[PDB]
Amino acid sequence: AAAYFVGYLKPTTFMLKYDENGTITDAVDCSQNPLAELKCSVKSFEIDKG
Amino acid sequence: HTSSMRGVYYPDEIFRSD
Amino acid sequence: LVKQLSSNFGAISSVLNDILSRLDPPEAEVQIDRLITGRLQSLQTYVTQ
Amino acid sequence: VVLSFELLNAPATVCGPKLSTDLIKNQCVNFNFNGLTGTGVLTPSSKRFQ
Amino acid sequence: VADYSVLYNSTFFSTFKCYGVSATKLNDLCFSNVYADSFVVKGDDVRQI
């Protein structure tokens, strides 16, 4: 087996969660859905209703 | 065939807390 | 208020003790004045709110 | 000759003629670690640096 | 270990114009890795750099 799995990228914004010991383990791309952009705007991973 | 939350690197060398 | 504290109000950097180390005082005061004005405006807005 | 400077938050390798001093912990003193100037109390915590 | 002492005493430099940092403060600040360049311009091309 010999594959490439190459994917291009575009300049976008990201919200990086920093857990204990300095690891990320979680991120939110604020360019795919309005929900992700809302999560990035308020700096939270759980959004309330409204 | 889809990059499902893949390719997340450290933007800098600065250590950050919670 | 914390985010406005770490804001580069048209200067070299938004963090103190970083422009006083790489620049000269006569050339650093120009950048310090803008940061001071921005922080004063942000703190005045915070106090009004 | 263009002398380009680069930090990238990397461990500094080229320093100046300044002489190093002794580590004074648990006391509000001035610090100049890798050029970072300021004043604080050098105290160790349980952080895990990579 | 840099000193930046052989560049300020002599005066054979045509245009000593630093950008970003000041020359008088390079003796105390450290760096990770410096990059030097070497090229010959046609006299009046220094202002373009």
Short mmCIF file of C-alpha atoms in Angstrom, two decimals:
data_model
loop_
_atom_site.label_atom_id
_atom_site.label_comp_id
_atom_site.label_asym_id
_atom_site.label_seq_id
_atom_site.Cartn_x
_atom_site.Cartn_y
_atom_site.Cartn_z
CA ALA A 1 0.00 0.00 0.00
CA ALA A 2 1.25 3.47 -0.96
CA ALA A 3 -1.14 6.44 -0.90
CA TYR A 4 -0.83 10.23 -0.75
CA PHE A 5 -3.90 11.61 1.07
CA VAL A 6 -2.81 15.17 0.26
CA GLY A 7 -5.19 18.02 1.03
CA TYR A 8 -4.84 21.74 0.33
CA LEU A 9 -5.55 24.45 2.89
CA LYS A 10 -6.93 27.99 2.97
CA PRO A 11 -6.24 30.82 5.43
CA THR A 12 -8.94 30.60 8.10
CA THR A 13 -9.36 31.23 11.82
CA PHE A 14 -9.30 28.55 14.52
CA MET A 15 -10.22 28.40 18.21
CA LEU A 16 -7.74 26.18 20.06
CA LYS A 17 -8.70 24.66 23.40
CA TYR A 18 -5.72 24.23 25.75
CA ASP A 19 -6.28 21.41 28.23
CA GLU A 20 -3.97 20.40 31.09
CA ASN A 21 -0.26 19.72 30.43
CA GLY A 22 -0.32 21.99 27.38
CA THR A 23 -2.16 19.71 24.95
CA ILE A 24 -4.85 20.85 22.52
CA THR A 25 -6.96 17.71 21.86
CA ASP A 26 -9.79 19.91 20.56
CA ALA A 27 -10.31 22.74 18.07
CA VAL A 28 -13.15 24.50 16.26
CA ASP A 29 -12.80 25.65 12.65
CA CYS A 30 -14.71 28.93 12.35
CA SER A 31 -15.23 28.70 8.59
CA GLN A 32 -17.57 25.73 7.95
CA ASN A 33 -20.86 26.50 9.73
CA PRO A 34 -22.42 29.54 11.43
CA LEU A 35 -22.61 27.49 14.64
CA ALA A 36 -18.82 27.14 14.68
CA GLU A 37 -18.42 30.87 14.03
CA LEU A 38 -20.74 31.58 16.97
CA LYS A 39 -18.75 29.18 19.17
CA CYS A 40 -15.57 31.04 18.19
CA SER A 41 -17.08 34.50 18.70
CA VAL A 42 -18.13 33.91 22.32
CA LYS A 43 -15.13 31.68 23.17
CA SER A 44 -17.14 28.68 24.33
CA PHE A 45 -17.84 25.09 23.31
CA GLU A 46 -21.41 24.89 24.68
CA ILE A 47 -23.84 27.51 23.38
CA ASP A 48 -27.16 28.32 25.03
CA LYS A 49 -30.44 29.02 23.26
CA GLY A 50 -31.02 32.48 21.82
CA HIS B 1 -11.08 10.93 1.64
CA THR B 2 -12.13 13.64 4.10
CA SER B 3 -9.97 15.49 6.64
CA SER B 4 -12.29 15.16 9.64
CA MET B 5 -10.64 17.45 12.22
CA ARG B 6 -7.11 16.63 11.04
CA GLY B 7 -4.08 18.87 10.63
CA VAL B 8 -4.11 20.89 13.86
CA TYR B 9 -0.59 22.10 14.66
CA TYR B 10 0.78 24.41 17.33
CA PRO B 11 0.83 27.98 15.94
CA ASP B 12 3.83 29.03 18.06
CA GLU B 13 6.17 27.86 20.82
CA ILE B 14 4.42 29.66 23.70
CA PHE B 15 3.03 27.46 26.47
CA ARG B 16 -0.58 28.26 27.37
CA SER B 17 -2.61 27.23 30.41
CA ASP B 18 -6.32 26.34 30.42
CA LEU C 1 -11.08 44.76 29.61
CA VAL C 2 -8.42 42.04 29.70
CA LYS C 3 -8.54 41.66 25.91
CA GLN C 4 -8.30 45.43 25.43
CA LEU C 5 -5.26 45.39 27.72
CA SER C 6 -3.41 43.12 25.27
CA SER C 7 -4.23 45.22 22.21
CA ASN C 8 -1.64 46.74 19.85
CA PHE C 9 -2.94 50.31 19.54
CA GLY C 10 -0.85 51.03 16.46
CA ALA C 11 2.51 50.20 18.05
CA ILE C 12 5.33 47.67 17.69
CA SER C 13 3.87 45.23 20.21
CA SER C 14 0.94 45.01 22.62
CA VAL C 15 3.05 43.73 25.55
CA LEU C 16 5.01 46.09 27.77
CA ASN C 17 8.71 45.63 28.57
CA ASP C 18 9.16 44.55 24.93
CA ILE C 19 9.32 47.93 23.19
CA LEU C 20 11.57 49.40 25.90
CA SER C 21 14.13 46.63 25.28
CA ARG C 22 14.47 46.79 21.48
CA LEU C 23 13.96 50.54 20.93
CA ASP C 24 15.46 53.83 22.16
CA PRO C 25 13.55 55.98 24.69
CA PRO C 26 13.10 58.90 22.25
CA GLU C 27 11.84 56.39 19.68
CA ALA C 28 9.92 54.29 22.23
CA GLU C 29 7.90 57.14 23.76
CA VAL C 30 6.03 57.57 20.47
CA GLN C 31 4.84 53.96 20.65
CA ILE C 32 4.20 54.18 24.40
CA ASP C 33 1.90 57.20 24.01
CA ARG C 34 -0.45 55.36 21.64
CA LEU C 35 -0.72 52.35 23.95
CA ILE C 36 -1.32 54.63 26.94
CA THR C 37 -4.07 56.50 25.09
CA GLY C 38 -5.73 53.26 23.98
CA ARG C 39 -5.62 51.73 27.46
CA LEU C 40 -6.95 54.96 28.98
CA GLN C 41 -9.87 54.99 26.53
CA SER C 42 -10.62 51.32 27.20
CA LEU C 43 -10.49 51.83 30.97
CA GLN C 44 -12.71 54.92 30.73
CA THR C 45 -15.26 52.95 28.71
CA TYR C 46 -15.10 50.15 31.29
CA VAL C 47 -15.60 52.62 34.15
CA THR C 48 -18.57 54.20 32.36
CA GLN C 49 -20.17 50.79 31.81
CA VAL D 1 24.64 43.16 4.49
CA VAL D 2 21.11 42.58 5.81
CA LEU D 3 21.24 41.22 9.37
CA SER D 4 17.81 39.61 9.72
CA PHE D 5 16.69 38.84 13.27
CA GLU D 6 14.41 35.93 14.14
CA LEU D 7 12.98 34.78 17.47
CA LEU D 8 9.90 32.58 16.79
CA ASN D 9 9.69 32.05 20.58
CA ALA D 10 12.68 29.69 20.24
CA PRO D 11 15.42 29.16 22.84
CA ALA D 12 17.89 31.99 22.33
CA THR D 13 21.36 30.85 21.23
CA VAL D 14 23.17 34.12 20.40
CA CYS D 15 23.32 36.45 23.40
CA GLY D 16 25.28 39.59 24.25
CA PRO D 17 28.30 40.33 26.45
CA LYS D 18 26.05 40.51 29.53
CA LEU D 19 27.18 38.29 32.40
CA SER D 20 24.79 35.81 33.98
CA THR D 21 23.88 35.93 37.67
CA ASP D 22 22.58 33.61 40.40
CA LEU D 23 18.97 32.46 40.66
CA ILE D 24 17.16 34.24 43.51
CA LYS D 25 13.86 32.45 44.16
CA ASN D 26 10.90 33.49 46.33
CA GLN D 27 11.70 37.20 46.18
CA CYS D 28 10.33 40.09 44.10
CA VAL D 29 13.36 40.93 41.95
CA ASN D 30 14.10 41.98 38.38
CA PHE D 31 14.58 39.30 35.74
CA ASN D 32 16.16 39.33 32.28
CA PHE D 33 15.58 35.76 31.09
CA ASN D 34 16.41 35.70 27.36
CA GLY D 35 15.91 39.47 27.22
CA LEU D 36 12.45 39.46 28.83
CA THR D 37 12.60 42.38 31.27
CA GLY D 38 10.32 42.91 34.25
CA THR D 39 9.95 42.28 37.96
CA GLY D 40 8.41 39.30 39.71
CA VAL D 41 8.74 36.57 42.33
CA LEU D 42 10.57 33.56 40.90
CA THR D 43 8.57 30.61 42.27
CA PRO D 44 8.22 27.09 40.83
CA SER D 45 4.79 25.63 40.10
CA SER D 46 3.46 22.31 38.78
CA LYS D 47 3.38 23.33 35.11
CA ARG D 48 4.67 20.85 32.51
CA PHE D 49 6.63 22.58 29.76
CA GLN D 50 7.09 20.71 26.49
CA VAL E 1 28.01 35.16 21.63
CA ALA E 2 27.58 38.50 19.85
CA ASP E 3 28.99 41.81 21.03
CA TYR E 4 27.88 44.34 18.39
CA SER E 5 30.97 46.40 19.23
CA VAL E 6 32.78 46.33 15.86
CA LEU E 7 29.77 47.94 14.13
CA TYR E 8 29.30 51.10 16.24
CA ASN E 9 32.88 52.29 16.81
CA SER E 10 33.81 52.38 13.12
CA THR E 11 32.10 54.80 10.74
CA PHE E 12 32.66 53.08 7.37
CA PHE E 13 28.95 52.21 7.10
CA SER E 14 27.08 54.31 4.55
CA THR E 15 23.48 53.84 5.78
CA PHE E 16 23.07 52.37 9.27
CA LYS E 17 19.26 52.29 9.26
CA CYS E 18 17.79 49.61 11.52
CA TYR E 19 14.18 48.51 11.15
CA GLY E 20 12.05 47.08 13.94
CA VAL E 21 14.76 47.18 16.60
CA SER E 22 17.24 49.87 17.61
CA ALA E 23 21.00 49.51 17.22
CA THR E 24 21.85 50.83 20.70
CA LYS E 25 19.81 48.01 22.32
CA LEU E 26 21.22 44.97 20.49
CA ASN E 27 23.99 44.43 23.07
CA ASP E 28 21.60 43.19 25.78
CA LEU E 29 18.87 41.38 23.82
CA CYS E 30 19.47 37.82 22.63
CA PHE E 31 18.18 36.05 19.52
CA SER E 32 17.48 32.50 18.41
CA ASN E 33 19.21 32.53 15.01
CA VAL E 34 20.32 35.52 12.93
CA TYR E 35 20.34 35.54 9.13
CA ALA E 36 22.88 37.61 7.19
CA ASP E 37 22.77 38.55 3.51
CA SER E 38 25.39 39.51 0.93
CA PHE E 39 24.70 41.43 -2.28
CA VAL E 40 26.12 44.42 -4.15
CA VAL E 41 23.76 47.20 -5.21
CA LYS E 42 24.36 49.98 -7.75
CA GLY E 43 24.80 52.73 -5.18
CA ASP E 44 21.36 54.33 -5.48
CA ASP E 45 19.57 51.02 -4.76
CA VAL E 46 20.06 51.16 -0.98
CA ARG E 47 16.93 53.28 -0.53
CA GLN E 48 14.89 50.61 -2.34
CA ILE E 49 15.86 48.03 0.31
#
